[PDB]
Design a protein around this nucleic acid. Sequence first.
DNA 1: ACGCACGAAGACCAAG
Lengths: 329, 174, 222, 240
Amino acid sequence: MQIEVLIRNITPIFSAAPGSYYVSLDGTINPPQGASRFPLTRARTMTVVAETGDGVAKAVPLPIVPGNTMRNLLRRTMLKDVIEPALRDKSAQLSIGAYATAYAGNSSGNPDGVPSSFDEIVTMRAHPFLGLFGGGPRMLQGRLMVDSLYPIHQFSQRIIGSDYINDSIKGGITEIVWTRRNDPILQLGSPDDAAVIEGGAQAANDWITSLLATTKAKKGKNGRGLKAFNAHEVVIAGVKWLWRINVDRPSESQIGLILLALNKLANQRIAGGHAKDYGRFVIEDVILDGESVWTPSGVSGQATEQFFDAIAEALDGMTSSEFEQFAAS
Amino acid sequence: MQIEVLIRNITPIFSAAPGSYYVSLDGTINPPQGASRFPLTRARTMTVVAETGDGVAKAVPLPIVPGNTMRNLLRRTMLKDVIEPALRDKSAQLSIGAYATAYAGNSSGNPDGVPSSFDEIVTMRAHPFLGLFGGGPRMLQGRLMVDSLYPIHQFSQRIIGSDYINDSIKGGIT
Amino acid sequence: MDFLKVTINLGSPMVEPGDLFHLDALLGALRVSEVRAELGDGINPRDHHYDLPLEQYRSRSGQWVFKASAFHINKGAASQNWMQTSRINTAEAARHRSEGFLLLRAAKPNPAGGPFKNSLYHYPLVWATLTAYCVGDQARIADLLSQCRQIGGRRGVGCGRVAGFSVEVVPEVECTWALRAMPDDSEQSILCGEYALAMSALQSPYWDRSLHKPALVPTSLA
Amino acid sequence: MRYPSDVVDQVFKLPPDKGLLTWDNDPVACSHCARPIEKGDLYSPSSVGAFFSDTRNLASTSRSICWRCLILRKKQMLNGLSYALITQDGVFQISKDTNKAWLFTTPPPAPFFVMHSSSTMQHLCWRTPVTLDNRLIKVRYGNNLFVVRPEAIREALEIADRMNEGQKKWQAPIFLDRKAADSGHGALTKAGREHLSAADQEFLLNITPGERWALAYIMHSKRPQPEEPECITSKILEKL
DNA sequence: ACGCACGAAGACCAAG
Ligand SMILES: [Zn+2]
């Protein structure tokens, strides 16, 4: 059952790409060794082949949010908003194995490997939450197959398709944000500012003396000071994204849980940058097998009423024993 | 919780954008090499996607104030005007390391790399100040999601919404 | 009963298989998906994944293999090392431990190992056109491949979406079905190229280590 | 040698431990090495503990471990077999680059297992499949199951040598990481991009991940000279 | 009595 979620990011989305990358003050990525280099944390990019000026399609880096990140985002939304409160209402208590299986699919509850009977597989793969995300000691296959967050861009037309040509952006959708850290002791200006420090002026003097000695030693040639200047690449705000979620053979409860998470999804962030408020977005359209089920007040309407009732009934009858059995603890 | 604060700048706002730029006497940025060029420290701009009157969406630069700058402004206000007066009223002295951690998140450039105990995490994240910003040698997750300063502009309509359209300013604000 | 060439086109990059990706394995997975759709999840997967429209090759010792070559990987771009992690948020875990939702007595998490372990793993992503040759029914193979949405591993995170597929009847001279894990005593004449003896399964599932056997695996395909 | 656990009684010659239960039911494979546990074979139920992070690599859900695996699962055995090459004659250490080059260019003829840990300590030996033919070498590096073909390694080394025979500044045709972790692992470098023919570029893009990992050790400005690794089974036995 | 918890420990080559 296809779900098409159209997402517009209010704030820049920062999915840090692994690796050590460098940039200069002018913005040149990986500058030559002649000029000063500053560390850079680039956004995640997937190499895709795109028709750059027609001709022969060439590989271009497309900034995306990884599919695993959004799989975990959906899981966290479900747990934090519709599952964990439901279990608290029953005063349910989760063991370490059940908690690990629910929140990360970990198998530390019983890593020996547990045999699952066919009746048990039917019972547990139909669980409203644990059926969607498999794992645990059983390592059941989850019913959920989420995709990455591909922006509606000229280079993603071979992945997204031509259905959203009106919302496409032609230029590059990344930028470099420069970040600086200051030594607070270097910004004291009077004994009033140093009053709260136990050593008063002597502690600040010792700190500055040690900083000067370390800086001079490093210049001539351990420990690192607080002053730092670096950069990181983020995907600019306002770009539209298409998110695709699929399920193999869902029950009504699982689709209802998906729709509840979608209703509560905007309260969460995408990728990283929690300190800088990165990843904020608004859902613009949810499409359930070709029909639009998104209203201004969230996913509603008669076409999605059965799923909500089914998931409400499943939540009311939800017990921690199901989680314990799934975790095989 | 979502807090939206509306700000009007009495005096011009200057946030230096790193990097060398040049301007001519006329006012043309990065002029042709034939004319005389003078160093220029441009205001920081963030590229944003704006739906102009043409109906198409294009990436445009928007003069902003960084979210890190606003975060440090909030932290410095909190410390210098609320927390530190209380500490001095009760005659509480911070060490130099605690001072640097409260004002910059960490007391040095080397994170510990050792996990924190669960009770320590709960205690710090419930703290009025350290819970909001976090950090420390054991890099803790704070509660404060603080954003940049976006001018209410025609170019920031897709970001901040359309409930402040009456305060929007059309032309260049730089 | 008919020589075919199965071609798969990708709409998203797939996970580059570490070992051979067999056409009969994919067909068996799709057939098991059909049986799950009709009956349910309580079926034994091993009772239905042999019901494929492919004829079998049987060697002298009775070892049999489906006549479906391992998929050929031709890369439209260089492979990309995709990084993924796994972690439990220690802030939420500590809060749940405080509030009694989680029953844990340990004072601190251990990111090196245990329930709160951070893990770093990588797998490669490739843009490829999958081509393989098989002996079987064109109509039924095309019908089975119609329901296939993704190719390769890591399907849960949306890797390897199928843009389209095609099944074509080709002359035997183009290529053979023998580019797969052959039985140990497979006849030399039917083998295409050099085959190196290795340990692999001859039937799906190929990941089952109890079913692994000394088999001839093509060196120009692994 | 047929199973990973076969190394115990064949190169370590360790008798089974005491207090082990005897299987008296229908045969079922070991949860670690997939070895059948028939009637009369000494086994032990699975007690891996909460720090076992290899549930995905378990061969079966029988929750039974043979005595050879129990010997393999000892800490002394795990540490000793972190960078070990176990052939029929004995156990060698491939930790050095020269040993890796020798193994991946001039492998031993007999069946052997190749291990390499990607971290401080990992469960490797019971996961590594046996290399039946030296032309198709199966290498277990941490959590990745690698297939290394020595002919492809030799061809890539020759490609690099032809590319950099004249220029004084040696440049790697393909970007390679010894940890197989960088996002540029296996991608063509610039110098290889505009200094290699179409056929050589196609060959470099069509190498297995294991071959990239091996070339990340063998391919440098000064290629290591292959050398025979030193036997280690005496050290492991002494420490056990 | 039994399961969980906590620290010491041991493999270690090493580049562009
Ligand atoms: Zn075993």
